[PDB]
Amino acid sequence: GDIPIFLRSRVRLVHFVTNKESIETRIFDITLTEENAEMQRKREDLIKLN
Amino acid sequence: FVIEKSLNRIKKFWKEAQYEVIEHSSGLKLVREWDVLEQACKEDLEELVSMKASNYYKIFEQDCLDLESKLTKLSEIQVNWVEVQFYWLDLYGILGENLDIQNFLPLETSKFKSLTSEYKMITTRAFQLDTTIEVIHIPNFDTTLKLTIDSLKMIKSSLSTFLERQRRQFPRFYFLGNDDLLKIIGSGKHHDQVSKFMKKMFGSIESIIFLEDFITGVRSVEGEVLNLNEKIELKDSIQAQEWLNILDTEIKLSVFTQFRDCLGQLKDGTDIEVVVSKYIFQAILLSAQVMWTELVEKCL
Amino acid sequence: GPPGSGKTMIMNNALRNSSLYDVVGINFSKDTTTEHILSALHRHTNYVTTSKGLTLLPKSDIKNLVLFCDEINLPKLDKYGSQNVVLFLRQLMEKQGFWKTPENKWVTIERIHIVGACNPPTDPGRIPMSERFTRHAAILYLGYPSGKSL
Amino acid sequence: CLYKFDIESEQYKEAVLTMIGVLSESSDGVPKLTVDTNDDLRYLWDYVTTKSYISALNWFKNEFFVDEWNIADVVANSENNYFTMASERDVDGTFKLIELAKASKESLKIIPLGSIENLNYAQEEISKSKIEGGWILLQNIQMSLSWVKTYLHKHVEETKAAEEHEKFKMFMTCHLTGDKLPAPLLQRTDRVVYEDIPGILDTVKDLWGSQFFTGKISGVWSVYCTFLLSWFHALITARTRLVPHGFSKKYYFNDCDFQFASVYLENVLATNSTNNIPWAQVRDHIATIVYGGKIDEEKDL
Amino acid sequence: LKNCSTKEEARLLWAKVQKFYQKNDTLDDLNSVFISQSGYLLQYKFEYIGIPERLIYTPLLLIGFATLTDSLHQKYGGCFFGPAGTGKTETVKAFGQNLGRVVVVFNCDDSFDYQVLSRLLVGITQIGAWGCFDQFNRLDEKVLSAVSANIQQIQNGLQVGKSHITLLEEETPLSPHTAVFITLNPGYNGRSELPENLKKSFREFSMKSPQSGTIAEMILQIMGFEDSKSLASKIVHFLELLSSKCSSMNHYHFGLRTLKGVLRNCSPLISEFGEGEKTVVESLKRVILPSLGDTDELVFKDELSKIFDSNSKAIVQCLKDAGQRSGFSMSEEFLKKCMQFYYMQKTQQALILVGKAGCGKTATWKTVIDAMAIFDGHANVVYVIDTKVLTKESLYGSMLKATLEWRDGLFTSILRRVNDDITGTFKNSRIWVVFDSDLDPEYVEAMNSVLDDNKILTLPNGERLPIPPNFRILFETDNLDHTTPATITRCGLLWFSTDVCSISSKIDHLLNKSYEALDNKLSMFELDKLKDLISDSFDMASLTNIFTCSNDLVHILGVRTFNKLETAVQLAVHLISSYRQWFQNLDDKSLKDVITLLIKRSLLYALAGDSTGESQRAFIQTINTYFGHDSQELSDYSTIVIANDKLS
Amino acid sequence: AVPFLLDPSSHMITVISNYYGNKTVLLSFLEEGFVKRLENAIRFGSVVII
Ligand SMILES: Nc1ncnc2c1ncn2[C@@H]1O[C@H](COP(=O)(O)OP(=O)(O)NP(=O)(O)O)[C@@H](O)[C@H]1O
Ligand SMILES: Nc1ncnc2c1ncn2[C@@H]1O[C@H](COP(=O)(O)OP(=O)(O)NP(=O)(O)O)[C@@H](O)[C@H]1O
Ligand SMILES: Nc1ncnc2c1ncn2[C@@H]1O[C@H](COP(=O)(O)OP(=O)(O)NP(=O)(O)O)[C@@H](O)[C@H]1O
Ligand SMILES: [Mg+2]
Structure with missing residues (x-):
């Protein structure tokens, strides 16, 4: 879908999508979650305990 | 006040509300242009419902709600008034005219005459009021229509x-x-x-x-x-x-x-x-x- | 012709110049109706009933009335590819009359000429006009002056 | 290729690549031949050069080096209540899904969808079997398909609480060549393809088998004739797999054909004498009408 | 059977044909007659058939009878597929006839209501008649879905033996004698198939090779003339040639349906002609030719000669009268198209006339109409509607939203004048509604009920206006690309390949018109002198080269030469006649020079007036050079001037 | 400036809806009465998604 150039300039456009280009990222997450857990956990709570 | 501004204008609109009317060959006065008010009523109702979102609406809630209750009962009768007309009109050709066919159906006809006369009285009083909103205050209006559409459908079914x-x-x-x-x-x-x-x-x-x-x-x-x-x-x-x-x-x-x-x-x-x-x-x-x-x- | 060719300048000039012809200005739009054209005439015209030609639609006086459709090729095409408003100009030109749409009775035009101006179908926004219409009008190209003229 | 080309050498790649290109009509040429460093590849080219194509193709599968997962292995191992198994019309996986059912946890329910009645009983027994837990099988779902869009599509979808119900599995038989099934409904279910293609002798045995269960409505000659027809069916049936060799197009010959052919035979047998002559008009009916009726191309006739 | 080698061969061949047997047994007479084929038996229901047009017996029709009897024996529906131009629906009909049943037929995608389809199916199951769905392959998703499901309810119930069945949310009883047949026409994708639900309840069979030859032989044989076999082969082979050699065209049908039209339209010509090939030749060029174009006409003629060799005076003298009256010249072509039309109008109720702008399509039907009025004495009422000027609402009519009141449109109102109330007499006259504009699927979809065999106009309120035979419909249009193939098969088609008229003839016609336009408001003294001046001032020999150089030139918004003529003549005439008053005292040389100047100018504008203005100048030189050298030369700015206060 | 959300499956539309609760008012550019129902949301402070 094509929006007017007028909208796209004025507007902050965000892609929530899985384009298959998201796979590289997502299999790493799974890989890391299942391989090195403690640094996936302490990847997540990095802001929490801080 | 963001509210009274809107409420005044709904009222101002419905006190000038008019159904267009042309009578058919004998008796009943038909209404042209249904969709206009069916829409405008639906639109104003929506404006009234969403009003309840306003933070300054609390105190005026009553004056709003009364209008809502009036329009909602117009909607109740509009929905019915139109189908009563539509069905009746469709049935008139089959029943009220040709003597031979209404002869073998003494019954569907015998009901059709009474419905017609009653629907005639109610409508004739209705368009004498010179406003459409006023219709809500007619005694046994909503009831009359609901009984009429039900009965017409019972005829249409019987015929089929x-x-x-x-x-x-x-x-x-x-x-x-x-x-x-x-x-x-x-x-x-x-x-x-x-x-x-x-x-x-x-x-x-x-x-x-x-x-x-x-x-x-x-x-x-x-x-x-x-x-x-x-x-x-x-x-x-x-x-x-x-x-x-x-x-x-x-x-x-x-x-x-x-x-x-x-x-x-x-x-x-x-x-x-x-x-x-x-x-x-x-x-x-x-x-x-x-x-x-x-x-x-x-x-x- | 191209822009600045002088199409609108010269023809409005010619028709305003002579007393014998009067103009009815119309600017066709890519949305235009037959009913725009008729209503465009109704200020300068009058319907009459004549047992000779039945219903007639002449100008309100003796001298002739010329309808000028500027940007005449712009009106759009039906899904099936036909522009009614042009075919209507055609019906007027070939049959010297048209059906009055609501009442189903034949109208005959009197002392009304159809004339138009436009840009070549080559340009964007312009539409092809059928030879069934254009056969009835003489077509003149109009272009930039000799430049010595300029 | 995707894997090895990464792991293995450039001479490996160009060899496997040229060898594939030979299987295709892409190019024909001898691969860079390394000696015993790559054993398997010499094993592959050996398949390509001796013009045995099947084993050449499944070289990759056996060098892929896996255990393929049986229908039984998918069904049992998979956690989901919903399976669609498509197949060519040539074969149906009902008889297999029966044996897979008896083999584990019983509960075989075969629901044909013929009628308005078969459809009501379908959706009655669905709502019944999903509380009770049994296996429910909807045969050739494609024929009712306006039913699926309205009822089934939403009735699988709108429920993620179907897992909260007992151990219950709904099977849907599909056809690969046939009307497209709604993409969301399909993705919602575990998909499989039923490929199992009987031998000719097998098919003759199974046809010949289904017949003696009918008792005897006929004499001794009809048996001989039933025998022949089983053979004839098995052979035609087989020829359709051949595709351009044998039959020009894909033709499907169902049980409807076999029934009609045998019905004709019983008739021509009952109507005539015990002389062996009637065979003249037996061929023509089966060839031109019963079986060959379906056929538009004169070659195939 | 005679020529069979062996007694066995005879029995086989005997077994492939329908045999008609009668039980001498009992009472219950209507069940006493049955049919044996392929060793399968079918009883004869005694429904009255009348005298239908009976199909020629060919082995294909017999095999079709065999597959159908084979199916019904087990109470499966039979189904036919195969390309358009064989026959299927009509084969099922004859199969019904042979068993003494009238087959009810549903033509599909006829804009039919599902209600009427549902209702007919309910009738057929209760009555127990045989239904046939013509072109079942084309039906809408929801329509086909529902009809199909009902057909399985029926077919299933027949196999099972149910006394009552349930369908569509309607319950009905079921006659054991009910049956449903289906014919399927192919799309570009390949031969159509039954929806999955019915695939198991039917038996599919192919209709392939219609055996056009044997049909033609026997039909030619019942007209009983000459060489039935010879003419058959030559005609069939010839249509075959026509299909092979002539250009592929969307609307060309050389099939068995066209061949039957030839054999049947061959019958009337037999009276004033012989029964020989000559009649066959005449019938062919009457049926085939009108549709064919430039090349394809000469192909028809070439391949016609290669195979078989080769109201006239009255009508042609009336046409000549009609052309002579409107100012039209009678050519080979113009007469040709007129006659083609005249013979079309007798057969075809709706006619389609196709050709480029300025073809003379209008001139043709108007002239042929006019000459029939002369000839037949039947007066003609002509309504010319430019179609796409009006919306469907405006043309056919419409209904008010609420009050459900009907209002007639243009077409319907002028139809009502004809039917409901006739103050005068429309009885003895022919009416022609002419649609001048481009025809699109939508408008004919509205009136396709008119074009139909139903001959009734369908309005949305269900007024169902019948249509008299006095009522004829014309479509004159330049292009057929967007029309329905069905609209064409319903109408007759008259194609205009080239202009009906020679360029000089049109010029001559225009001049006549311009002269007669003057004849009303001017004296005969001037008219004679001037019309002599104009006509003899320019000759076709000069002009033809000019029109030819006009053809080599760049025309912005170009109109072909033939159509520019109207501008040419009318400009010239009016221009000359504008100055008529100064010709009394004018010298004899000077006028010819003046006439020539006024004509050169008008000929310039009418031809090159749409050119670049550089090209205008080049074309002026082309006009001076191709007319007389002595004749007054035209210049860019050349003009005639006359003195203010005095004549000069 | 106004966010423009893009997802092929719109789970994000129910994310915003879960965030603001009942307050969310969902409109479309293709629906008929949209123009007014926007005028309603805007005057009385509803959270709009188009
Ligand atoms: N002799 C002239 N006298 C006056 N103005 C002239 C003359 N020749 C050219 N022009 C100019 O030409 C222009 C006229 O453009 P005009 O032809 O009226 O628009 P147009 O015909 O509609 N072309 P287009 O824009 O494509 O529709 C004006 O700017 C005039 O000043
Ligand atoms: N054996 C036959 N004898 C005489 N006429 C035949 C025979 N077979 C076909 N026809 C004619 O061939 C034409 C084909 O028409 P029809 O039977 O309607 O074709 P269809 O396959 O049923 N539908 P369509 O092919 O689209 O026209 C008709 O004019 C039939 O009369
Ligand atoms: N036989 C003829 N002899 C001489 N002049 C003719 C002849 N036929 C037509 N004309 C002239 O050439 C013109 C051709 O136009 P017309 O007869 O209207 O055909 P047409 O195809 O209907 N034009 P159109 O409706 O735009 O497609 C006529 O208007 C006459 O002026
Ligand atoms: Mg014309």
Whole structure:
């Protein structure tokens, strides 16, 4: 879908999508979650305990 | 005040509200332009519901809610008022006019008259009010319409059922369809108006031959004439659905007769040319076919 | 012709110049109706009933009335590819009359000429006009002056 | 290729690549031949050069080096209540799904969808079997398909609480060549393809088998004739797999054909004498009418 | 059977044909006649058939009878598929006839209501008739879905033996004698198939090779003339040639349906012609030719000669009268198209006339109409509607939203004048509604019921106006690309390949018109002198080269030469006649020079007036050079001037 | 400036909806009465998604 150039300039456009280009990222997450857990956990709570 | 500004304008709109009206041939005054107010009411209602979101709305909630309750009851009657009209109009052509058809349906008609008169009174008072919103204050308006639409639907249903039960007595009627069938049911006085339809329920046969008391035969779309053995006797008052069934059986019986007569002639060894003059096509054909088969059988 | 060719300048000039012809200005739009054209005429015209030609639609006086459709090729095409408003100009030109749409009765035009101006179908926004219309009008190309003229 | 080309050498790649290109009509040429460093590849080219194509193709599968997962292995191992198994019309997986059912946890329910009645009983027994837990099988779902869009599509979808119900599995038989099934409904279910293609002798045995269960409505000659027809069916049936060799197009010959062919035979047998002559008009009916009726191309006739 | 080698061969061949047997046993006579084929038996229902047009016996029709009898034996529906131009529906009909049944037929995608389809099906199951769905392959998703499901309810119930069945949310009883047949026409994708639900309840069979030859032989044989076999082969082979050699065209049908039209339209010509090939030749060029174009006409003629060799005076003298009256010249072509039309109008109720702008399509039907009025004495009422000017609402009519009141449109109102109330007499006259504009699927979809065999106009309120035979419909249009193939098969088609008229003839016609336009408001003294001046001032020999150089040139918004003529003549005439008053005292040389100047100018504008203005100048030189050298030369700015206060 | 959310499956539309609760008012550019129903949301402070 094509929006007017007028909208796209004025507007902050965000892609929530899985384009298959998201796979590289997502299999790493799974890989890391299942391989090195403690640094996936302490990847997540990095802001929490801080 | 973001609110009173809107509420005033809904009111200002509905005090000038007007249905356009043109009466049809006799009695009931119809309304043109339904969708306009059905929309505008739906739109203003939505504006009133969403108003409840406002933070300054709390104190004015009453003055809003009263308007909501009034418009909501207009909507209740609009939804009904339109279908009452639509159904009635559709039924008037079938019921209120033609005397013969309303004759065999004393009942659906007997109800239609009363509904009509009542719907006439209520509408006539309604358009005397010179405003549409005012309609909500008419005693037994909403009730009248709901009773009316329900009753009309009960008639429409009854009619549909009546016809479908009518076809099942002479299933060929399923080829006609409603309009023409009603013409047959009513014209069963005359018997001559049934002839038109004999292409549609048989297709082989075009029209039907009378001695004015009795039915002597039929004539096919080709122009062939099939004379029945037994002429079909008719009395001044007799249902079509009966003698039509007698006819349908007698044309088959008649074809069979011509078949055996002609075939027996050919068996006795008359020339085919002799026969060609004296019988209808179908009979002399099956004759030739059966006899042939027998001959080329022994010839084998 | 191209822009600045002088089409609108010269023809409005010619028709305003002579007393014998008066103009009815119309600017066709890619959305335009037959009913715009008719209403465009109704200020300068009057319907009459004449047993000779039945219903007639002449100008309100004696001298002739010329309808000028500027940007005449712009009106759009039906899904099936036909622009009715042009075919209507055609019906006027070939049959010298038209059906009055609501009442189903034949109208005959009197002392009304149809004339138009436009840019070549080659340009964007312009639509092809059928030879069934254009056969009835003489077509003149109009272009930039001799430049010595300029 | 995707894997090895990464792991293995450039001479490996160009060899496997040229060897594939030979299987295709892409190019024909001898691979860079390394000696015993790559054993398997010499094993592959050996398949390509001796013109045995099947084993050449499944070289990759056996060098892929896996255990393939049986229908049984998918069904049992998979956690989901919904399976659609498509197949060519040539074969149906009902008889297999029966045996897979008897083999584990019983509960075989075969629901044909013929009628309005078969459809009501379908959706009655669905709502019944999903509370009770039995296996429910909807045969050739494609024929009712306006039913699926309205009822089934939403009735699988709108429920994620179907897992909260007992151990219950709904099977849907599909056809690969046939009307497209709604993409969301399909993705919602575990998909499989039923490929199992009987031998000719097998098919003859199974046809011949289904017949003696009918008792005897016929004499001794009809049996001989039933025998022949089983053979004839098995052979035609087989020829359709051949595709351009044998039959020009894909033709499907169902049980409807076999029934009609045998019905004709019983008739021509009952109507005539015990002489062996009637065979003249037996061929022509089966060839031109019964079986060959379906056929538009004169070659195939 | 005679020529069979062996007694066994005879029995086989005997077994492939329908045999008609009669039980001498009992009462219940109507069940006493049955049919044996392939060793399967079928009883004869005695429904009255009349005298239908009976199909020629060919082995394909017999095999079709065999597959159908094979199916019904087990109470499966039979189904036919195969390309358009064989026959299927009509084969099922004859199959019904042979067993003494009238088959009811549903033509599909006829814009039919599902209600009427449902209802007919209910009738057929209760009655127990045989239904046939013509072109079942095309039906809408929801329509086909529902009809199909009902057909399985029926077919299933027949196999099972149910006394009553349930369908569509309607319950009905079921006659054991009910049956449903289906014919399927192919799309570009390949031969159509039954929806999955019915695939198991039917038996599919192919209709392939119609055996056009044997059909033609026997039909030619019942007209009983000359060489039935020879003419058959030559005619069939010839249509075959026509299909092979002539260009592929969307609307060309050389099939068995066209061949039958030839054999049947061959019959009337027999009276004033012989029964020889000559009649066959005449029938062919009457049926085939009108549709064919430039090349394809000469192909028809070339391949016609290669195979078989080769109201006239009255009508042609009336046409000549009609052309002579409107100012039209009678050519080979113009007369040709007129005659083609005249013979079309007798057969075809709706006619389609196709050709480029300025073809003379209008001139043709108007002239042929006018000449029939002369000839037949039947007066003609002509309504010319430019179609796409009006919306469907405006043309056919419409209904008010609320009050459900009907209002007639243009077409319906002028139809009502004809039927419901005739103050005068429309009885003895012919009416012609002419649609001048481009025809699109939508408008004919509305009136396709008119074009139909139903001959009734269908309005949304269900007013169902019948249509008399006095009522004839014309479509004159330039292109057929967007019309329905069905609209064409319903109408007759008259194609205009080239202009009906020679360029000089049109010029001559225009001049006549311009002269007669003057004849009303001017004296005969001036008219004679001037019309002599104009006509003899320019000759076709000069002009033809000019029109030819006009053809080599760049025309912005170009109109072909033939159509520019109207501008040419009318400009010239009016221009010359504008100055008529100064010709009394004018010298004899000077005028010819003046006439020539006024004509050169008008000929310039009418031809090159749409050119670049550089090209205008080049074309002026082309006009001076191709007319007389002595004749007054035209210049860019050249003009005639006359003095203010005095004549000069 | 106004966010423009893009997802092929719109789970994000129910994310915003879960965030603001009942407050969310969902409109479309293709629906008929949209123009007014926007005028309603905007005046009384509803959270809009188009
Ligand atoms: N002799 C002239 N006298 C006056 N103005 C002239 C003359 N020649 C050219 N022009 C100019 O030409 C222009 C006229 O453009 P005009 O033809 O009226 O628009 P147009 O015909 O509609 N072309 P287009 O824009 O494509 O529709 C003006 O700027 C005039 O000043
Ligand atoms: N054996 C035959 N004898 C005489 N006419 C035949 C025979 N077979 C076909 N025809 C004619 O061939 C034409 C084909 O028409 P029809 O039977 O309607 O074709 P269809 O396959 O049923 N539908 P369509 O192919 O689209 O026209 C008709 O004019 C038939 O009369
Ligand atoms: N036979 C003829 N002899 C001489 N002039 C003719 C002849 N036929 C037509 N004309 C002239 O050439 C013109 C051709 O136009 P017309 O007869 O209307 O055909 P047409 O195809 O209907 N034009 P159109 O409706 O735009 O497609 C006529 O208007 C006459 O002026
Ligand atoms: Mg014309």
